[PDB]
């Protein structure tokens, strides 16, 4: 059970930790979040009461170091930092715990929601999508654009998701134009799984990370990447059975967790209608099709 202490809370802010969130008042004696489950990535995220624009946050894993949050009054945001002095950090945390100035990560024992959303997400993969190698944690916000969005402008502040483009020489073998356009199995299986991701786990981890960035920060390019990665599988006639079974579970928890009021901007009608009703895998996503139809029947 790990801890992210906060130096202080000088500005009024909604704090997210994974799928939970808490309102903190200006100069409220809030000193951080305890009982954070070891074994998963986590994200701590912020929306200022005064500017409901720029949701932003930090992806981290407590196994990789001691992390705390301090407000920077110059840059005007809550910053994640590493404390390299182990004994100082244990001493800071123990004091704030004794004074009970910390909120407890409020996990129900029965509840595998966060495991189900982050099953394949690894910090080492996040740090290759979000490039800032001097830190063990990763900053994301609402406004950060993707390498792909940037091609169609600051490379250092980009999300380096794997570029997927159905009308690209990477996607289409010379002499197999119609076959490769209508059946993306070669693009999925040879180019993406064998070629770039190496295994379905890395592919699913990227998909799950794009979802969560879409959901927690309203990051538009992340939402594009999540849909493109769903569409590449559903548009492939030849997908390993284990991959289809896992995709169904993955998308089920994503759709289950989505705020009901964000399905208008976070869900792409064309991609979902195509994937569930027209595509090769139209009959392979039973759980996902049942929750989509019962929760978002307007969209379909």
């Amino acid at each position: 059970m790990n801890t992210v202490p906060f130096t202080s809370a000088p500005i009024e802010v909604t704090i997210g930790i994974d799928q939970y969130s808490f309102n903190v008042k200006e100069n409220q004696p809030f000193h951080g979040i305890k009982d954070i489950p070891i074994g998963h990535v986590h994200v701590i995220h912020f929306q200022h009461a005064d500017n409901s624009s720029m949701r932003y946050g930090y992806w981290f894993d407590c196994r990789m170091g001691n992390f705390y949050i301090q407000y920077d009054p110059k840059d005007g945001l809550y910053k994640m930092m590493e404390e390299r002095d182990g004994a100082k950090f244990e001493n800071i945390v123990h004091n704030f715990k004794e004074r009970q100035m910390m909120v407890s990560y409020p996990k129900i024992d029965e509840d595998d929601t966060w495991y189900n959303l982050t099953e394949f997400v690894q910090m080492d993969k996040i740090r290759k999508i979000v490039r800032k190698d001097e830190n063990q944690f990763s900053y994301v916000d609402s406004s950060m654009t993707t390498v792909q969005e940037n091609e169609l402008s600051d490379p250092a502040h980009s999300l380096n998701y794997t570029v997927i483009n159905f009308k690209s020489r990477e996607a289409i073998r010379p002499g197999h134009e119609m076959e490769d356009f209508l059946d993306k199995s070669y693009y999925l299986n040879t180019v993406m799984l064998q070629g770039i991701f190496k295994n379905s786990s890395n592919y699913f981890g990227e998909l799950q990370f794009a979802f969560l960035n879409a959901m927690f920060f309203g990051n538009y390019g992340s939402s594009l990447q999540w849909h493109a990665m769903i569409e590449l599988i559903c548009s492939s006639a030849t997908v390993p059975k284990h991959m289809l079974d896992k995709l169904d579970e993955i998308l089920y928890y994503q759709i289950k967790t989505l705020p009901e009021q964000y399905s208008d901007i976070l869900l792409n009608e064309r991609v979902w209608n195509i994937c569930l009703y027209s595509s090769f895998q139209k009959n392979s996503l039973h759980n996902t099709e049942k929750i989509m139809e019962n929760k978002y029947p307007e969209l379909l």
């Binding site: 009308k167 690209s168 010379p174 134009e177 356009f181």
Partner: protein
């Protein structure tokens, strides 16, 4: 984006462009089987690829053999059209290759784009114009070479005959679109109008009769009359 009435003059500028019509690529007669089910029999088709500026027509003949043992033929017909257009471009010297290809039907956009990925500087555009290039098979000499083909064949025509000696591309294209619109709306009437006077013949190297400038005005008037009548009937107005 899309080619329309607003940007019509662009057809006759000095950027090489080609229209591609795929509407006569896959052609069938529907008939009853002995058991009283329905079946199709394919007949020879053609891709209609036209430079509107020069009148140069690249008539790629689609022999029924290409459909042998294939499925989803109306889908394959779009990709076969895109393969052949792609092959035609690569066959042309660089300075002859188009800078734009305009497809008469939006269903050709993705097939042609995917086949032309090697040519990122060639723009693939739709049009809002309702062009009558479907009636190309009402031109007797084009119909004749398609039906007689025993194998895949490319045949080169100038669809303007020698008109550009006396008129601009804009006027020649207008004349062609009016003739094809007539042939499409009432083939028998249109063909009667064109051949009724036996003294005006079609040269061996031409598609259309050798009309004087004055005879063309009369003919063009007869075609506009034919089109309006048929419209009044179609719509009871």
């Amino acid at each position: 984006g899309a080619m329309n009435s607003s940007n019509y003059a662009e057809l006759f500028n000095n950027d090489i462009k080609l229209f591609v019509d795929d509407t006569n690529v896959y052609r069938v007669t529907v008939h009853k089987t002995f058991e009283g089910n329905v079946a199709t029999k394919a007949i020879n088709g053609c891709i209609f690829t036209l430079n509107p500026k020069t009148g140069h027509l690249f008539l790629k003949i689609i022999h029924t053999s290409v459909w042998a043992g294939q499925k989803r033929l109306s889908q394959l017909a779009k990709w076969k059209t895109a393969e052949e257009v792609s092959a035609l471009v690569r066959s042309l010297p660089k300075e002859e290759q188009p800078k734009q290809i305009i497809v008469t039907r939006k269903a050709m956009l993705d097939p042609l784009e995917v086949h032309m990925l090697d040519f990122p500087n060639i723009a693939i555009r739709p049009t809002e114009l309702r062009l009558p290039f479907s009636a190309a098979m009402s031109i007797d000499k084009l119909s004749d070479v398609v039906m007689k083909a025993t194998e895949p064949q490319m045949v080169l025509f100038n669809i303007y005959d020698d008109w550009l000696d006396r008129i601009s591309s804009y006027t020649a294209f207008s004349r062609l679109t009016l003739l094809l619109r007539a042939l499409k709306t009432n083939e028998e009437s249109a063909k009667m109008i064109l051949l009724s006077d036996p003294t005006i013949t079609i040269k061996s190297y031409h598609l259309w009769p050798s009309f004087t400038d004055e005879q063309w005005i009369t003919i063009e008037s007869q075609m506009r009359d034919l089109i309006l009548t048929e419209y009044g009937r179609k719509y009871n107005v």
